[PDB]
């Protein structure tokens, strides 16, 4: 099982959109996938996946033994092979324990999940640290913007020193850059950091580039991840990303105008 | 001194943009203002205010007595009356500590202490609203952001120092941000009114989606300083309203 954390540091760059679209895309390709909301007290993954009303038990319920993984997992209705573990709604920072999260991830491997997508919250404090701690890979989600690039760099420092793999001299977390809300026209008028500017700063492998797309607002309005909209450019770029995660090369679209 | 927290729950809605534009606008109007970055381990306010390289000591340095408020405050160079207290960079913020800092700032005669809150409802965000007299709930016309703003209203009413002591409650204002009237009329975006019917609080500003905001952070120059930017003008309107002057809402129809 590949445990993939979708992280960023900066808030509102597209972690939820990406965690949802990518988990769905992987499911579509026949890979049994669960996407877990690691937020503390804010439930946004269920809202984007469109299952906000089937949420009975959540991640922290399972950790405190008030529910089984089976009781808390929500099987997506629209896409076969896809499951969602939603976030707790308590303000308690403790709630998510390292031992607790580990136990849940082992249960999921035992249930035969190939991909465990961890939708991280913003920050570098508790919920975000917990989402990357057991990761085998990290999708660093970034906008061509100054705050986001600075905060992604900080997150790279954490991936390299506070993850379980780093703290034990194991093979390090495999890192990928998901450059999101890109706008080639803005780049050429000199108003927006280009894809290459961002790579020269955060020096990691590009795994996708998601164009700014009016389809993404319409997708969350309906609770339908944007990869399911076969006309959306952001959807197509996410389906490319999924191919690259599965090992297939794909040319990068939507980087020139 | 009015302590104003800029809050949201949801990440990336415009808290930093709004905290910077509004602190600046207030300073421009001759009100001595400090804007404080309450983030834990991420420094974003200094980047948007353009003083990332003058940062020697930060908010947590002052709380742990490694520096004085005078050593950590950065006086803005471009706008008179404006000061920035930047965020710590450790992975600290105590209630007693933050209270001591806020009293020192009142004693230094600051009229407005703008608290630039982080995302979430955990530690840094709770600390930024706890001592507030007002809250600017920053919201996009989007489903995650409206849901998370509602949660933040619940906390403002129960976990703030005013709520926990039956004092006059925190005065709350909605700052609707990244609005797009054209998107609203094509039926693709929650309207200003949809958002008011749900989070039932007083509107204090509406900031349009504006390509000027990316250009402003690129330069480290708050968007209110760009006198041609619609987002800038809407933030100057907001500042007027905070100071008690009515102003008609622009950029809500197309």
């Amino acid at each position: 099982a590949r445990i993939i954390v979708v992280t960023s540091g900066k808030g509102g760059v597209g972690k939820t959109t990406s965690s949802a679209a990518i988990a769905t895309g992987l499911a579509q390709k026949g890979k049994k996938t669960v996407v877990i909301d690691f937020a503390i007290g804010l439930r946004n993954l269920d809202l984007i996946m469109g299952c906000e009303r089937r949420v009975v038990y959540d991640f922290v319920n399972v950790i405190q033994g008030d529910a089984t993984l089976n009781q808390a997992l929500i099987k997506d209705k629209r896409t076969e092979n896809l499951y969602i573990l939603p976030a707790s709604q308590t303000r308690d920072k403790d709630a998510l324990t390292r031992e607790g999260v580990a136990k849940v991830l082992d249960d999921l491997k035992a249930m035969d999940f190939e991909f465990i997508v961890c939708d991280s919250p913003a920050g570098i404090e508790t919920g975000a640290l917990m989402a990357l701690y057991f990761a085998d890979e990290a999708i660093i989600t970034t906008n061509p913007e100054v705050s986001s690039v600075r905060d992604s760099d900080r997150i790279l420092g954490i991936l390299a020193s506070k993850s379980r793999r780093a703290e034990n001299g194991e093979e390090p977390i495999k890192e990928h850059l998901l450059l999101t809300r890109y706008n080639p026209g803005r780049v050429s008028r000199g108003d927006m950091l280009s894809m290459e500017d961002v790579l020269e700063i955060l020096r990691i492998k590009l795994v996708g580039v998601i164009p700014e797309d009016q389809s993404v607002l319409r997708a969350s309005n309906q609770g339908e991840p944007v990869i399911l909209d076969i006309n959306a450019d952001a959807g197509k770029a996410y389906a490319d990303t999924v191919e690259r995660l599965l090992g297939e090369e794909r040319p990068f679209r939507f980087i020139e105008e | 001194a009015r302590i104003i927290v800029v809050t949201s729950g949801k990440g990336g809605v415009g808290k930093t943009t709004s905290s910077a534009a509004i602190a600046t606008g207030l300073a421009q109007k001759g009100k001595k203002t400090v804007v404080i970055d309450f983030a834990i381990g991420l420094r974003n306010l200094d980047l948007i205010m353009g003083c990332e390289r003058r940062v020697v000591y930060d908010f947590v340095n002052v709380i742990q007595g490694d520096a004085t408020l005078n050593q950590a405050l950065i006086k803005d160079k471009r706008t008179e009356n404006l000061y920035i207290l930047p965020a710590s960079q450790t992975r600290a913020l105590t209630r007693e500590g933050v209270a001591k800092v806020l009293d020192d700032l009142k004693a230094m005669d600051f009229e407005f202490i703008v608290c630039d809150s982080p995302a979430g409802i955990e530690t840094g965000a709770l600390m930024a609203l706890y001592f507030a007299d007002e809250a600017i709930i920053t919201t996009n016309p989007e489903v995650s952001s409206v849901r998370d703003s509602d949660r933040i209203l619940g906390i403002l009413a129960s976990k703030s120092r005013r709520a926990e002591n039956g004092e006059e409650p925190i005065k709350e204002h909605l700052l609707l941000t990244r609005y797009n009237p054209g998107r609203v009329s094509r039926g693709d975006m929650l309207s200003m009114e949809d958002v008011l019917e749900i989070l039932r609080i007083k509107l204090v500003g509406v900031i349009p989606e504006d390509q000027s905001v990316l250009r402003a952070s690129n330069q480290g120059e708050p968007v209110i300083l760009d006198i041609n930017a619609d987002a800038g003008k809407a933030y100057a309107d907001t500042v007027e309203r905070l100071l008690g002057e009515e102003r008609p809402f622009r950029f809500i129809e197309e």
Binding site: E52, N221 | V146, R147, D194
Partner: peptide, 14 residues
């Protein structure tokens, strides 16, 4: 018209 769907889904939660 997805703004209307968004608004109904929102009211049920809040």
């Amino acid at each position: 018209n997805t703004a209307n769907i968004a608004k109904e889904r929102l009211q049920i939660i809040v």
